[model samples]
Target chain A: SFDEIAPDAKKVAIYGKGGIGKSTTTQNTAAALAYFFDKKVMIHGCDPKADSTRMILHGKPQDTVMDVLREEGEEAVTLEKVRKIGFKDILCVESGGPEPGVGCAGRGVITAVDMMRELEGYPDDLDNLFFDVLGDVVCGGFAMPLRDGLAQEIYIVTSGEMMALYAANNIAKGILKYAEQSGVRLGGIICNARNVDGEKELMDEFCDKLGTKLIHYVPRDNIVQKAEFNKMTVIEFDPECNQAKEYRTLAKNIDENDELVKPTPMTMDELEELVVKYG
Target chain B: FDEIAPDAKKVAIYGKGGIGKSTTTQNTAAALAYFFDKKVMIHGCDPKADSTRMILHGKPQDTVMDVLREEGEEAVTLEKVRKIGFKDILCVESGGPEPGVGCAGRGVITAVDMMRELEGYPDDLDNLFFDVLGDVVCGGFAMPLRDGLAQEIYIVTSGEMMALYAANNIAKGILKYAEQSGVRLGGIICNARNVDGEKELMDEFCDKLGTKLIHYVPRDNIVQKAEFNKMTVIEFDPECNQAKEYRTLAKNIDENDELVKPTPMTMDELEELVVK
Candidate 1:
């Protein structure tokens, strides 16, 4: 049964709550990976907003998997229709959700991902398949990416703030549940530092309790904001900036790292203590 | 013996996800109904969450039960707990899922009421009961009472295997309301799924958690057969073995008056009880 999984594809899920910069971070890191390793990459935006592939598609959000599922029904959409070639011949797709608040947003993620696997030859010939998940674990629907053999590696994007840490811990708990049942593991925490007090130290301590590491510390850089406003990554906007190098280093470290583990999530009280201790 | 449960105390159970609301509600309702009347009500909250006197409790969340309850409001004062008299002492229970997909809470109310008037309580004066199924049917816990008849009910459960799980969950929903409300656990009625060494297993479960099995209805095929007939064994065939069992249960419940306000559960207590 396990033989069905592709030998070379490294499927990864990128998860964080809304406004946590999941889109910008995912696309830019993906672009960096493509530029450096020459590895074939595919980015599937699992948000209802459908803006994950904007940079690759000339800053235009294309027709999403949900739209196609609605118009043609899920069974009718072909792999070719869902797959679009992006920067450096990388494949890009967006598994969009329902129009806000009407139906289960998490269910939409599950449906779209299932449709993609059924139609497209997912995780077979690909080097990497990235699921840019929406923030808030919401329900089991959003956990679709980590199910079975889909995305074995989960990278959570969080900051030094209490709310962000709380969300990160909750996401870790979700990951822990899946990890115990499936092979999915917490790859590491990506510290999108808010330049707050003791930010990096707090994340380091938090990750320590969770039995993982703060894999990358992305400093607060105006270059990131500047490029994002233009719908471009630092690599594209101004490759000379130190911000571009930060992303490049992050990509290199991720490629070299092999330390994925099932993280032990902190309890609410423990999390509060840490927040009070470091906040 | 499939006679109508004319007058009985009916109540329904409802709550959030994975909260053992179904098992608790059913057992408690069963404990009360088993003793009071030979003809007890036990309406299953399916697509129809109607307010039935015998089997159904409260109005279904969204259906005609809600409509009638709203309309009934002009005639009577809405209270969390009250008493109504049908054949025995008719009570109504309503149950349902979250809004949107399946039979909404409104349906539970409608269906329960449909059964209630059909059974005709007070004049009947036996016992009415409804087993609201599952947790997280809809957003708000689909509590049965909005009009009282199904008042002074108990939540059936034990310390073992998420008794507190359901209790805490139901309490959370109750806490959200500003109305004067309460559902006392007449006592934890243990209907052992008959897991290994059940008597001790259940006793230990109750002892650690500070509760007792008000009654333990062993796993029986008679109840299943009764279900197949869509009738209580007492009504289906009172002379049959299962009929006798239900009658005995009813007699015991009729004499019982020991009711206690339920201990509000905590996540910690629930975790300790269930983690092992």
Candidate 2:
């Protein structure tokens, strides 16, 4: 049943508002899936800033497509220059943008996916492909993977902030637009806890409203940031810790019984009402 | 010598920005204009000078900087920067910078100094209200207090932390000026936040400063609506309960008992009493 729902080569997209900790979560979860689940995982970070892959590449800035494009012409740009092998043989790539104002950047993602496809990029050897995106705007540029089914399953990371939830709802709203067209689905809501002020309940209610699941709750811990300050995922830095288990557990659940569905985004008035009730 | 020129009631309303000092000053000025026959000239002392906008129908008046910039100091006439509006109130706004340039208090110093030197200052008025931007005893902020202009000083504040903080520094400013200046803290205008335990906190604040909690203007939607139409609550909705509140505030100000010297609080002591 899980195989029937899950893609043969599952392309997982981790999305969240800026500074909501998706890059950290995405990398750590990938590390868990790679380490525990024995899946060959690859992460393509579509985050705008060049500093996006600093931690994943272990504080060394990997040459992104944009950096290559800047140095050499498009004809000279190749995968070897853009890709880097990080810990646990997990491949990391940054399809970094040109000028940042690249009109229709999801279109850029479209181009990147095509180049990868043309190059026979994602092989049968790879089990999972994670699109680690900057969650500032989900439907705008760089969200091409979501709409075109490049990243078939989405996991929205959020906390108690209205800003976080607003972004989650918007990404789902974008998914709902092409859910019928491309069979794309929002896999679940990945919630983190800070204040614990009825935030889980609110995210659960929102998940239900959006026709999704509550995937995981990463409780507030300094261990994740501490591990990250040394340029490592919590799984890589401390696998025996409870925080590593949270990621491992998330991947384990995600490995089974995951469903794709059209998310029902609330109207503005409805969201305002719900936020007033929950916030 | 000072007694002959003093009956004109030169009042100063100073407070934190967005604490509704301008709103309170204008409404109270309106009540005075509407009730007792008085020509109230409100000299707005903030750069983003909408201090008299409710009385001036939300139109921006020429700033002292703008007037001085466009034409010389000779052209920066009282007729250009000031205007007569609602209840015969003369409205004037001074400046600091264009929008975000530099030097905040310097423009205030320039305005007050020019108003005196250029004879642009009004003396024939029954009352003069200076709507000031409160930032303690900074050279710019102390212009009205130090320059022997505004004698009856009222620092408008709410029980909100920022407003309380502003009031704390302003009271310190008052003590700094009281050594040589005749300017005294007129009283506290407790503009309500509708937040709990604020009235008690404000009352305690007033007590610590040795001033009266002159009037309690409850937060009401009517004042917002009147402001929406760019009119003071007293001028727009004269019969509203809010208008009556402004009237009460005016009567409190009208009484000569509404004045005191502020007892300055030290930083640590203020944080313990109000901030925490």
Candidate 3:
């Protein structure tokens, strides 16, 4: 359906473990694409937390597609009701889930995506449709985007921490699980650096081992947090900052990226050895 | 069926990812084992299987789910389901499906239920710790609380925005089961992140939620150093202050009697407290 909206648009999903700055990275990169590269974009928030589009929407609490659907029937699930126009005319929608410990969040992801497709949520002029998905669980429900071609390419955001790398490997395993069936490809690994020693090299080697590449290594910066405090992306908060330049490079790398691959996940021992070597 | 470890001080520790839930759980279990000489069993509910790594001393153990998937439920036994870790502490991990293939939450439920069914936990244990995954987003992960396996919950959080956000969400989960089950919010363990006014913020956070900050663990590199060796701080270096802190935390939990139904803060209240 997104293809119908814009056939050539890059349908990408930015995935990572919870609180690993996937949303921050996705929103900032989307903003950079719009602000610097002059691209039309749409961000679909797939995490139950529903904070994926917060900075992009400037802290405006949006009515998620699922919440709206639960309250009102399908007829009331119009694009105008669920979608919000964020910074730089970027279309933003969050697929919120049931309250904690209540229902399956993964199913909520599918319902929201289906409703968005039924409603033709994306505009025809969109150049990039970003799906900020929750990758922590990678269960049948959260992996909906990787199935049946909802997202063609995926970019995983991870830090240099052990658990972060483990999650990245798990996400890669998920990608590899569906790559043959769905023809989905992993775009690259975006290292949101945590200032760990040898983090950049560790991530690079990790990608190399998985037959992929590290797209960009974003250094940990206080400016990014400051920008978040203002409910804006680094590019929107201060275009002249170094963090903005890094994000611009990331956006540029993603825009020109052609090295999509079906990743090979590492075994537990191999992963632990790799981490011990560089961690 | 519920007679196993009926008097065991069953506790579930939850928090944000990478916020050190496993590290805390393993260390506290070690303290209870070494310091108090208590029989402890750690039921790792997260799929990562890293929950018991530190206590097991680099020995990778099989999970209940993995065993069931490959060998069926009939093959599950105490020897296959549980591993003896340091200081005679028992360990069991509920490893789930490969990243995105199946229902991880459901897998957790199945593993936990089978463990109980098979009497995987020794009845003489004094402590049963469920080191749960980061979030209780679904019922499967909340099996420990919902099924009355773990009656007390200790949320490990830092003063960071997302950590506190997850803490509040976990409080809501506890509140959800508090009325329906015997589960209660035991206390809040603030694993320090050196945020500005972190201790005070956690104190006020617990106070507002009708709980107390059980322990404000100061940030220490020794914990990481110990983890690098696949050992808990108490096991790695007993003389370290960090180990002392964990021992104190274990003692506090052992003597704690302040469990209560939590009053989770609203979005506006959470923002106001953190923003100020």
Candidate 4:
């Protein structure tokens, strides 16, 4: 019995510290995977900021699933209302959180995931389902994508800064927690460079220590911001740019990546020592 | 009868992730303690739980929630949870669940409630700063405002669109709590990103929000250098230009009386103002 509605479909999630370019990297890589490789892609944004799919969708933020549910009720909710086709036909959905001083932010993520399942939002031909999740795994709801069989591979986007690595290590810990029970695994680390000294070496060593690999290290360039100014991914904004090539390489690496592992997180002292050694 | 020191200023500084909220908070607290000789206590409300690292000059301390989760609530005492940082500035972190585990917002609420129930605030305290996670994504994250614990709120922002969006969202959060409590928007503190028309945009944005730009901190590498040493600019290089800037920010906050209910703008209005 072929149990697969879509065989070889990859459900991956990108996570990192907030403001470390998780959304930027996710959108750019997704754009490359779709535009350059002609893959069918969908990005489910799971952060409260709800800007994960903004660049891919060309800046106009679509209505989040949570907002739609709040206004029209679940009975009236439809895939057409929440999902938007973005650049190169990437299906985008935002699992928006509640307003401040309202209900649980984590629960909002869970609600969106459940609604998508009930509505059967994923198409049969969808090749990649990339969930751009919040920076912090601050709660169980944020981890919904990694639970069960939702997201099988997790790629952590990080920088060389202490906080960024700290958050990345925490993410690895979260992945390990889910990997024991679920099918989730750490695909690898993707370094969004912050130009810290020996950042690449530090990322590589940090990955080595975590029993994973640095899949790709995206350099910091102003072109990324230039693309952002136009609300476009690098590939869509200027495909001939070096940054676009970098994203394309990252896309290719991720596409062919088979080095998924259960990450071994470091203790506070060990992480500090690793930074010191790199410094 | 006021259990908290009547003269004490309770202020909460919020901004989206990595906008230098912790840096600003620690620098201001250090300036207040070093220059003004004020008694200060900082409660780190974010799950990251490293708000006091610069002042403490060590690894992140054990949080109240961590203690409560591991050793139970009865074991959470001020002696265990509180750390004496530079110049006797008291520091406590309301640490939440591990990433992808439980409710961090609830962790904040629980930690704050525990601190209050224990009457941890000393009578001689001059300032209490709640360094909260800026997103304020849930009611639990807004615990400081809900209980009227933090009356004056400051938002750390930049001229960037994402930062402004976060600032406006925070303003909306403040407006929600202000209606039910004494909390008010103290003003905006711009950690400059050197964006074109940034200062003027910030000024106009503050004007539209019915507040003023309290301080415009210029982009400086010294701040990063100070961070490498695990110290705020105030404590690391007290006489540097950046330290002076933080001192100016500290004095402005000290003498500030510009608290008001915020007038949050729609997305379109915010975008138009920034783009112009």
Candidate 5:
């Protein structure tokens, strides 16, 4: 009989296009679970910006694996050279890539993550590992985080805008392209609402078309920006804020939620019509 | 034997990546040169950016027929459209896959200038075609001009760093590819280098590439800056410096006679070339 693979880690990847605030949402949510819930957690920033661990590292952008490799040469990078522990016993890492308009950002994400697995033994002892991806499902490189045994639960952070909805649908298409080959299933959509026209209804409809649900509707909150300016999350900055309570509810729902389904994306025409109607 | 065949206007399309270069290039190149050049130039941008005016007009990305067919689409459509057209001309095109990360730039030069034939065309007042993929392969795209088909070349540019990179890369590619193609490479037909690096690098690289870039590109500032703008470089900015470059390049190459075999390049080599 073939040697059995060890039980895989329950992993999740947060996907969205550029400038969609994936890093902020994922980190804050992750921090809530790690600090308040006292669950072991890790955050991996898969964007070239490598800002996933800003709050964890007290607003300092850590030296990413790719950056270290680029500076010290790939062969010279060691396990200790890359891994950095942060607040609340949570591990934080950034998988960096080439500067804009240069090498492949998607590929960089993949390579950086692979390095983490091989060097740090990621997810082996951890309760959770979160991949904060860059926005857009432009190519395979962007989906590297979801590759086999990595991210089983994919939560898309989207707004009620036309472009945001389009991005969500496109991400589903990307997931479908990989699901058959990798056994990754769609978890649900995380509505990072922009408070646009009919955002809730539009997102609800969009989720229906994608064969999924709008699991959480994070409303527009200025506290997010204020907290971000201080390099903290709502849960950490002001737990008394309504936004903090919303995050707590979201975290609890995520921990207790069992509803997961493969998403069905909308057609281009249908998506356009939806945008015109609600966005 | 081939009685009915349309005139072929070989239009060279060039631009940066992700700036809708392929879509705009294929659509406009299809519209402007379709009547005169039934065999449209379908040059691709990167190794993954498929070059087919047919694709823009609802065809697939790859070319199975052109690869196998003697005259490709021209031979297939000759009987139907030729009788209503001009002389029998060949529409040659080339392309690569995607941009930045692959050897798409090299593919542009090697595929367009090398694989297709432009020497056997019947003498007529039709058009010579060349679709230079993204501006990343400045040396490669110039092959059409250096090889003598694209005496007039057009650059699809925009005001973005990536766009300027394409423009600079196209200039460098043209400077080198033109040396080998024997075509009178002209000025930069500015398609609106919208970002910071556009004007400065365009001028510097054009000078370095040994050509007076831009002749007849239009300038619709608002349109050029719009997110959904998908018009040809000539159509979007008809009055701006971007459009002016297209007009200048078009005029200069049309009346120009200076042709040279451009120096082929590698990334490291390009870095050195630009340093000078």
Candidate 6:
């Protein structure tokens, strides 16, 4: 029974397995929204790497909110200290993880989000927000976003790759709990295409079976690789390129769309069944 | 604890996890169940759920929480989880949620109380041995040390620092419950770890705790060979020295077992004793 957007932002997040290029997609898509919609979007990178904002900041890695919180005993963590305004000075806060394994990165994310709120509340014109989460294992630190009801519309990046489908279904199981408990919704499945056999049809079928939208198909673009080598989002590198437009096109669709539902996630067996039939 | 049936002296076996608590209790239980021709129950109280495996051939023998999660508490019957192990020793493992999550103590507490209420715990001819969690002083791990649960608690400890600490803390827990519940520390069984100054250190702990080092079962890889066989040293080789030790322990408990309130050491005293 918390606010869907906590008072000032239409909180949203992009969830996919880490190596599925979650940060890149989310960062580019977020900046695309800022570009096309004139929306003041924030990309809160939830992954421990804390470099999701690299393209936005033009390779300038900001001091993470988690690091600031820990150094000052969490009391000194303010939005001014934690956030690094990048690509229109938009808010980008990374929950900087701890030294390897002595501590928990999950707790760091929890602390970072709370302290940032403690300081400036959230964004004012906060038209949107996106979280680049850790992969399909969404139980602990990664699921914190959905709990606040701040990030409802979860866009799971998936592919025809067996592991991708498995991971997508696995996290959807845990995420369903948060969605049910809060008013959070499983928005749709974004086919971040691997372009394998029966990929798009199976993905749409997968979405249809899972009762979510096949919102958009983000294609396999090596422009993604080229821009990333320059530490730039595809949107920033070539704003008029096909890849950049793909994001803005999705961003445009997202701008008009609204609704939240606790999706019925598939079981491992059910997921395996889908793969057997589809693959 | 055994007063549920006056004749059967319920004994608790405590040790840090992986300190041979299961081996000692199961071997002794098999011997007790076999020799005395008595109806014995070996109720294991740990989430590991390995206690009754040797006896039951690894079969209900799963966690109490596993059933409770699926079927809820009332359906978490003793019969559902119980099996007749070696020598027809009745076995039930009171398993719990994993460590540091959920109401961890919920498993043992429910296992004890529910079984106590539902079934008056079988008025059979013989003993009840509870092989509790690694450390007896832990959250719901205290369920075994409480009133009318285990009349006497025997700590199976090595002279290893962490395990000694575990035993010492268990001693404290026993004393705390002992004052009111009339439960007693049934001395220490130094399941030896081949540590330097182990015998003397264990003796000192027993001395401070007002108990004796009842047995110093020496460490040997021979016991491990049977464990690898998924059987006890006694069951695997009845003629082995390790088997004889387990036999003596079972014999001692069945014969002339002593129980007294332990004088558990203070932190300062424990530290001093360990260093010495």
Residue B133's lDDT in candidate 4: 82
Worst 10 residues of 1 chain A by lDDT: A98-107
Interface Cα RMSD of candidate 2: 19.6
Model 5 residue A203 CA deviation (Å) reads 1.0
Per-candidate TM-score against the hidden true structure? 0.52, 0.51, 0.95, 0.90, 0.59, 0.53
Worst 10 residues of 3 chain B by lDDT: B134-143
Candidate 6, residue B90: lDDT: 82
Candidate 3 lDDT over B1-276, as tens digits, reads 367698788888998877888888999999999999999999888888878898889776688777888898678888877889899999988878777777777667887778767778777889999888765456578776677778889999988777888889888888888888788989999999777788888888998999999998889999879877878899999999999999999999989999999999887799889877
Clashing pairs in model 6? B105-B140, B209-B263
Judged by DockQ cut-offs, the docking class of candidate 3 is medium
Q: Report the error of model 4 at residue B230, Å.
A: 5.9
- Order the candidate numbers by lDDT, best to worst: 3, 4, 2, 6, 1, 5
Q: Order candidates by TM-score, high to low.
A: 3, 4, 5, 6, 1, 2
- Candidate 1 residue runs with Cα over 4 Å from true position: A1-5, A74-76, A121-123, B1-276
The pairs that clash in candidate 3 are none
- Over A151-205, each residue of candidate 5 has an lDDT whose tens digit, in order, gives 7778889887555676677678667766776767778888887776678898888
Strongest candidate by lDDT: 3
Q: Encode model 2's per-residue lDDT on B1-276: one tens digit a residue.
A: 143135678888887665778889899999989977776778888654678888988776778888887787778887787788898898878866532133355677787777666565455667778888763245465777676577788888877555776677677667666666777888889899898888888788788778888888899989868876878898898888899998888878877565677886644465467633
lDDT (tens digit, per residue) of candidate 3 on A171-192: 9998998899888899999999
Q: Could you tell me which residue pairs clash in candidate 4?
A: A137-B99, A137-B100
lDDT of 4 at B233: 87
Q: Which of the predicted structures, 2 or 5, would earn the higher lDDT when compared with the native? A: 2
* Per-candidate local distance difference test: 0.57, 0.73, 0.85, 0.84, 0.56, 0.72
What value of lDDT does candidate 6 attain over all alpha carbons? 0.72
User: Tens-digit lDDT track for model 1 on A62-138?
Assistant: 67888888898756788877778877777888777654213445556677666765664465776776788865433
DockQ, all models: 0.02, 0.02, 0.67, 0.52, 0.07, 0.02
